[PDB]
Design a protein around this ligand. Structure first.
Ligand SMILES: OC[C@H]1O[C@@H](O[C@H]2[C@H](O)[C@@H](O)[C@@H](O)O[C@@H]2CO)[C@H](O)[C@@H](O)[C@H]1O
Lengths: 138, 136
């Protein structure tokens, strides 16, 4: 189910950081953080830790379908243990830091960054905080 | 216009903080932060700093009408300068702070606190941060 959604119509990319703190309930489920663009609620960036396999799957949902999965074996999550995920965007990538360590970068596929106005968090995450902050560029 | 909206379907009241950082663009416009209840996006709490008169108005839209306005004694905001406002809810009030100093408390009128699932920010505020945190 949808756990959290935010809308910032002026565009929350590039140059914004999103920090999500929480924990899972289960050791076999998953959660996801999505950045959506208008029109059409296309998913510019989907970040999906899958606890059953301890893999992070990232992708984009453009033209009504997923593209190529980018799968990461770095999995700094454990069931029921609090975590902090920070996602920051520049002109070129989304950058993911978990528990203050850099984990991965995901190259933009949706180039219309300013049309990314929505953040969505779904499935097995008990959220303690969401922060959305303008951090500038380099 | 709508500047920001957040939805937490499990209910973001009581026992949550919302911290908004930003600044106004004008010397004499206004902005508002509204907490909305489900179903219907109903205005459980409306917080409205009005820079033309330098007055804060708080109210609720309940039983089909706006209630009695609470006009705050003080107006600590300065236009065109960054501020940090926090709204924290307990069982009895919304508590509002600027620079971590309390400005006012507003007694809950909508008692269905758990149905308050949305935060909405409208009009003259250039947002630099929104933080929504469960205080537990
Ligand atoms: O690529 C990201 C998404 O994957 C979807 O699941 C895929 C699955 O990973 C793949 O192995 C195959 O079975 O097709 C599935 C459907 O496309 C998820 O459903 C979706 O939520 C994204 O995570």
């Amino acid at each position: 189910a949808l756990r959290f959604e935010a809308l910032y119509p002026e565009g929350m990319c590039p140059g914004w950081s999103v920090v999500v703190k929480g924990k899972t309930s289960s050791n076999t489920s998953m959660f996801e953080i999505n950045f959506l663009s208008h029109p059409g609620d296309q998913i510019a960036f989907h970040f999906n830790p899958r606890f059953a396999s301890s893999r992070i799957v990232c992708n984009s949902f453009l033209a009504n379908h997923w593209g190529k999965e980018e799968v990461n074996k770095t999995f700094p999550f454990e069931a029921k243990e609090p975590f902090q995920v920070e996602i920051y965007s520049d002109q070129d990538y989304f950058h993911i830091f978990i528990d203050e360590n850099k984990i991965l970068q995901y190259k933009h596929r949706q180039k219309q960054l300013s049309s990314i106005t929505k953040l969505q968090i779904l499935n097995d995450i008990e959220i303690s905080s969401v922060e959305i902050t303008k951090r500038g560029l380099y």
